[PDB]
Amino acid sequence: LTNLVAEPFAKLEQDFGGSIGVYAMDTGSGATVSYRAEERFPLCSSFKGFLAAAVLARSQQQAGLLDTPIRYGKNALVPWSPISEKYLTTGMTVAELSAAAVQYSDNAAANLLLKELGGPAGLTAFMRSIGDTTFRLDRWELELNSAIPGDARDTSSPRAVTESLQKLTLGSALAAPQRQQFVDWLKGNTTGNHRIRAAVPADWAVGDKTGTCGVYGTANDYAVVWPTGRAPIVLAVYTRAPNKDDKHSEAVIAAAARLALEGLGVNG
Ligand SMILES: *C(=O)N1C[C@H](NOS(=O)(=O)O)CC[C@H]1C(=O)NC1CCNCC1
């Protein structure tokens, strides 16, 4: 059921000047679209969705966790912390940091939550606990964005991202209340309007998390999409390119998402 219908991903990535990795899963039939799906790509900010899921999993064993107020100093505010900078003088709850990390890609929030989990290895351990043997987080913000060609640090594959996203949003990896909270955070993302969402009709529900390393043409998005009248679709689109100064493209991500939906026979 993989690649029943071929799609022109090679032409797309050639025009982009790099590599595109796509995995998409029709959760009803099990049909998939797969292109470079087992190659590694840098996560960039996209690890923050899984980070929030890991916090929610922890909160199943610690009922007070989400409501815990976290204070932080100015030294915690690394570049691109649009929410946590507004609450420097007050603090934010763990839930609020999680929402900020997911929905605004807040870097300070992400580092504060990584500390809660025992750092990159703690997040990696959570991913292992749900059966993901590919994911690895190695570094913190901002160093995890280096996106060096051939460097496996801070990478996963489109396939493993999609498989893990499915487990967390639709499967049983989270308890039902936590699962719905994760979904709701993804649905409220503000940074993805020009990526997978641009390929998804407005009358379908969708949650996503983006990433943009800023070098090596490296950017990404993953999403859970609910077309009306059929089972949900899970998909991941990752990009990279050979040169440090190569630019990312949101349009290429949206175009790859459209090809994936077309390959699954999902009318969009
Ligand atoms: C994540 O990839 N981020 C955080 C933020 N928005 O994330 S996104 O998914 O909407 O793109 C800005 C881009 C990126 C990030 O942390 N960029 C840093 C800029 C400075 N150099 C290190 C990377």
Numbering used by the authors: 25 to 57, 59 to 252, 254 to 294
From the manuscript:
Of particular clinical importance is the widely disseminated class A SBLs, including the mobile, plasmid-encoded extended-spectrum CTX-M and carbapenem-hydrolyzing KPC families (both produced in opportunistic Gram-negative bacteria, such as Klebsiella pneumoniae, Pseudomonas aeruginosa, and Escherichia coli), as well as chromosomally encoded L2 from Stenotrophomonas maltophilia (a lung colonist of cystic fibrosis patients). SBLs hydrolyze antibiotics via formation of a hydrolytically labile acyl enzyme intermediate, while MBL catalysis proceeds without a covalent intermediate. The diazabicyclooctanes (DBOs), including avibactam, relebactam, and others, are a new BLI class with improved activity against a wider range of SBL targets than classic BLI scaffolds. DBOs inhibit SBLs through covalent formation of a carbamyl ester to the active-site serine concomitant with DBO ring opening.
